[PDB]
Symmetry: C3
Subunit: 552 residues, 3 copies
């Protein structure tokens, strides 16, 4: 319990002393570190970002003189609405109509709205274009043309084109002072666009005076290539963008506004979609006991102040999350070099690639790395068997069911014989499937008999048992007794169990000798000749030999 949680597991590793792999690893590590640092610093991913809340206060300055003969002056109480926040309006043109009473009168002829006769007109129809209700009559607007008769404020001048050139062109010489107060409430920071010690006699310039909050309207239009004289005729919408890219860290504090301009209304608006910008405003006051009204259609530019931006401040959680996101990228060197080792250890490299390209020859050392790095094993299953023929240099793995066919004729995968422990070695008639002649028929049941139908060689020749090594290793009683006493020093050498143990040790001795690996010697199957020679050397009394058994 306690000893199970008081454990630490660490990976077994191979440390390769390689110039190429070391330099590749360090180059990849430096590349990953450089990119991660660059992404962290350029994007400021260690910071929490917060949008601002903004308040705008505008002040327009400028007066204009207009003739018609009546000479008048327009000041901020004339061309400017009480709007002093995000939007302000400057009038650049106007149309006047005095003395309007709600009564029947002909509509203004605009865009060919002339009425030929009462048939061309329609009674009881609401007309938003003329802002009246047609009575179905056709009275002459003028001595030449006739228009529909509407009940509305009269006289009506709807559809009259705006004066050209614009009357209040001098509005391009007006200036606006903009005061912008911004706040980041999450970061608990506030600031404004006008600081103490700032020059007040300046006007904004994108290069000379980029922080002066006083803007000449004509300069605003000239900056983005717009014609104030042309826009003044019908009006439009212009946007003054204030951008706050604010760094709220003490060591890199920077919170200044950036001013830009952008036309917000479509220059190519369809004629039916009301191009430009205007509004009709009226003063109402009855006279002679009759409701009167004076109407002015004012054209001008609406200015929208768009204030946006974010403020960033160092946050530990953001940095931790970013570092955790980038941590897995430092396995790139491992992935790349392991891919190099695995790829160049394949046999297809030496067979096909190396003869073609001799530059790839010194990279055959990856087979050594692969065999010092990976240990291939197979699943121990009931059908797993290993055979080895003395007339062959390799070993066969049979990993399929035997459907009565003898194990001799069954084919399997070719696996190589592992190299032995040379450190220790440095010390001082016959059946149809039998190609050696010493094999004997199996005494196992029929359905299992094919398991024991194996020969020591695939081709006719001498038997493995004929060699002196078979007697020295497998059949030597003294060697087997010493091996058995190594494990159990005080073993009782009496009874029939000693012969059973001796048979087991002879089988193992043979499996170890022919199948070097203990993983393969466990599932190795002895040929009939060796098996029956062993059983003739150590016979059992009153029983039947069990044969190979599954070690799991």
């Amino acid at each position: 319990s306690w000893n199970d949680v008081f454990q630490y597991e660490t990976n077994k590793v191979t440390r390769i002393q390689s110039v190429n792999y070391g330099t590749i690893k360090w180059i990849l590590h430096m590349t990953v570190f450089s990119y991660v640092s660059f992404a962290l610093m350029s994007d400021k991913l260690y910071q929490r970002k917060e949008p601002l809340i903004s308040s705008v206060h505008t002040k327009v300055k400028g007066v204009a003189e207009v003739t018609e003969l009546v000479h008048g002056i327009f000041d901020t109480a004339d061309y400017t609405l009480p709007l002093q926040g995000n939007s302000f309006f400057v009038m650049t043109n106007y149309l006047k109509s005095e003395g309007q009473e709600q009564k029947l009168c002909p509509e203004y002829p605009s865009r060919g709205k002339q009425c030929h006769s009462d048939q061309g007109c329609i009674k009881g129809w609401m007309d938003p274009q003329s802002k009246g209700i047609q009575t179905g009559r056709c009275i002459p607007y003028d001595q030449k043309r006739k228009t529909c008769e509407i009940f509305a404020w009269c006289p009506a001048e709807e559809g009259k084109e705006a004066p050209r050139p614009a009357l209040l062109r001098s509005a391009e010489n007006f200036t606006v002072l903009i005061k912008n107060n911004i706040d980041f409430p999450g970061h608990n920071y506030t600031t404004r666009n006008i600081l103490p010690g700032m020059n007040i006699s300046c006007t904004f310039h994108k290069t000379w005076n980029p922080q002066c909050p006083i803007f000449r309207l004509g300069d605003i239009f000239q900056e983005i290539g717009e014609n104030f004289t042309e826009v003044a005729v019908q009006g439009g919408i212009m946007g003054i963008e204030i951008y706050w890219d604010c760094n709220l860290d003490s060591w890199s504090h920077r919170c200044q506004p950036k001013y830009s301009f952008r036309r917000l209304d479509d220059k190519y608006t369809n004629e039916s979609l009301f191009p430009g910008y205007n509004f009709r405003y009226a003063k109402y006051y009855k006279e002679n006991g009759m409701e009167k009204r004076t109407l002015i259609k004012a054209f001008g530019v609406r200015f929208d102040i768009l204030v946006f931006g974010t403020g960033g401040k160092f946050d530990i959680i953001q940095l931790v999350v970013y570092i955790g996101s980038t941590l897995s990228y430092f396995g790139l060197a491992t992935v790349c070099i392991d891919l190099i080792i695995n790829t160049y250890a394949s046999t297809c490299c030496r067979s096909r690639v190396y003869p073609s390209c001799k530059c790839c020859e010194p990279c055959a050392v990856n087979e050594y790395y692969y065999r010092k790095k990976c240990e291939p094993i197979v699943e121990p299953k009931p059908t797993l068997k290993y055979v080895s023929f003395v007339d062959e240099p390799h070993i066969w793995m049979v990993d399929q069911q035997l459907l009565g066919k003898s194990l001799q004729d069954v084919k399997g995968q070719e696996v190589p014989r592992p190299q032995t422990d040379f450190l220790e070695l440095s010390r001082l008639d016959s059946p149809d499937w039998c190609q050696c002649g010493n094999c004997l028929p199996s005494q196992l049941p029929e359905n299992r008999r094919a398991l024991e139908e194996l020969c020591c060689r695939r081709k006719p020749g001498q038997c493995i048992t004929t060699s002196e090594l078979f007697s020295k290793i497998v059949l030597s009683r003294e060697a087997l007794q010493l091996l058995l006493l190594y494990q159990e020093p005080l073993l009782a050498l009496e009874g029939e169990a000693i012969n059973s143990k001796l048979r087991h040790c002879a089988y193992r001795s043979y499996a170890t000798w022919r199948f070097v690996s203990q993983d393969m010697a466990d599932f190795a199957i002895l040929p009939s000749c060796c098996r029956w020679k062993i059983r003739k050397e150590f016979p059992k009394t009153q029983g039947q030999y069990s044969g190979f058994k599954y070690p799991y």
Copy 2:
């Protein structure tokens, strides 16, 4: 230095040829990859997202005719304020009061505000409800009821209920054209909701014409199940939501507005919390040398245009961060299969689980995988000792202090004897704690004597030294000499150092034979019988035997 940084470390691995584990690994890999790809594509986590900046320009079209007998017409200069941005107001009802002068007069009787007598009223009290100052008198408002006397604009009509049905119901037939210009300044993209080639004679429909920016107000109310006729009596607030879900990538560019509607005022507002929407506006003009005023309480619907949304564009840093965040999820297959291997290699599986369920039987192969994967080691500490009794099949680890008690009676953990290197083996009176009789008392100091008080067996019987293997392996002088000359071929076989080396080699020979692992043979303790037989075979001259020493 340079050779220390020019190294590469790679993990040692075991490659298991398993159908089950391979298919599980690939299924888990595919599941993780599928979910990661789905999360990346559906949420567009490879994109940087930016909120928009918006500009709105509205145009209301519609005229109404109202009787009272005076017949009048209302156009955009009557029912519409100069607001043409995010909000516009449409008047649906009104109350009129002409000829107001600042003087004493009775308050309007509303919600039972009748005054019984001067006691019920109060002098010198500001009354925001009646918008006046009470003088403490109680004059009759009418021939029947009496109300408090206030100094304010007179005549006063505060508290008068709005007309029902609403006078300007026809405002439901009005239309509004909305022009919306949006910008993503970080992505440097701009667009508008009206494009060239768009039909202008349409009206918005959620299915037939979902991109027409012309909205009929009654249709707006009908879309969300609101009654324009009922809302028109007292007014309200309606929101036109413009949503921009914009994809700014070239291969998947899509930036269109989506229009929705939502009532913004509470339908069930408390009567004291001013339900509906209205405002009082007045025209001031003196007459007869006295300040006069005409007041209109206008009820109507305020429309708030709410424009919101984000624009996304592909960003390499976002993709890198997301991929780094998802990289660690590809260790799921390793975690799961390692848990399977570790869990099924426990002995509790075979003892308890396998007899109950026979389907779990073929999964006993995880013990082989575990023993081919993990190598358990223990911390080398001064109290670490190993003992092995010839009458027992296992080994005992003593990992605690000996408080004078003999090592024979001290209990320890049962560890198994590791399998030997069978590849190499295939070649050609007595003390009270002594159960064999050949043990001798220790000559070490008392406080350390208990270290050497160990017997070869826990039960009475034959001694380990009696076996011939003890003479062949431990006591054979020729074997020890050959072993010593293996390490040092030109060793000088003279002096008393040769006997010391021979004793050391005999101890090691015995430890290796009984404790197969070199990790366990280092801390193994020889029993007294073997130790003293060795020391009688190779005695030392003029000294005391040091005994077991800590190899670290």
Copy 3:
């Protein structure tokens, strides 16, 4: 193909039974888990956050009485603009000017704008400060001073200071009711700041009544330490911040507003930058056939309602991304303990650190862990050679080109001789560079001769070949024959190939004996004495000895 994808690779590990390392691992795991959980819960990183869309409806209540003698009352139609959204204005002071006609008249003397003579004035100059056009004359404004003569609305009172104390001070006793409707459209949630069952007779207090949406203006000023009486003289801008920190999860639902106040205009604005807040508004109506105008300069406080906040709701993708970002932090225990193992296994620890500090002594066990964890290997390259001198206890690695110099005099890195497999061992004239006398000159070509110019010892003495172990291991014909028949039991012992194999086995036998590791024995170079003794024991017929060959 199919058997290549049906594989699973698992890491080989060492399980250390250590109290220190286990407790360190679990402490680090718990620390990482605790911090990750705290960061997830405190920052709610499992949630998708969305900004709100807001609608504001304000209602101001309050009336004031002002003397001048004319006694008047101001209600919401007097001091309040039709603004009922994010901003509303309350008038706190005013200046009046009646009967204005567009004509020539002297400018008001403000800030020393007196005109000494016509020289001091200028003709044809637009003056935004006085809102007129100077005609270049100098007429007396009063009997004492003279000012410039401008064509504008007359009489002009520009530059007149605001009345002190403020006329509408009682506006501090006014109240505003704020209705705020907020929506999260991505989360499909909507709410408002007034809920059913909320008291209506309350007023806001930051502690007693923090959810009452009725605010007294004087209380707003007192909360942030502002003086309403002083601000009322010239006006200002105040911000009512509504903050919505809304949790939209069912188990932790919380969506309430938080109210704060902040002055939005600069208290220390420069006199030339228009401090305070005011606007000039005029009523136009002609009289006596002449255009007249009444102008009022109104000073007051503009209130900006700033509504901001985010709503968060549980999102599975956010949680998955956060967990993936934090997953790599659980390798901290592995990194730390591996660093501990690697650091304390260095030899500099025992040589320098341990003698100084005896507390670091029990931590010398990390050498055992390091050698059970890491296997150092080197790149097999053509210049890789190993030598071992019998008069030395170590082995020399030569990893550089031999430029004709004999291998005996070439220096290399000192590598230690690995420990043998003691489990198996427990069983039963001369050239100038020759220091033993049995070496012979090499028969290889000159450019390669230096490869074979190696001696068995660096100092004069006995030769390695003189030992009996050389005959038993290397020169024993029977041992070599048994070793050869171990690999090939049916080998044909005929021809000259048997002597070649015997020479190869003798070289290997010697390399294994002197260079224990097979990785080092492959590149080991035999000294001339041993090589020529072997070749005299097994000479070849009609050929030249090839010598050492690169095994790759």
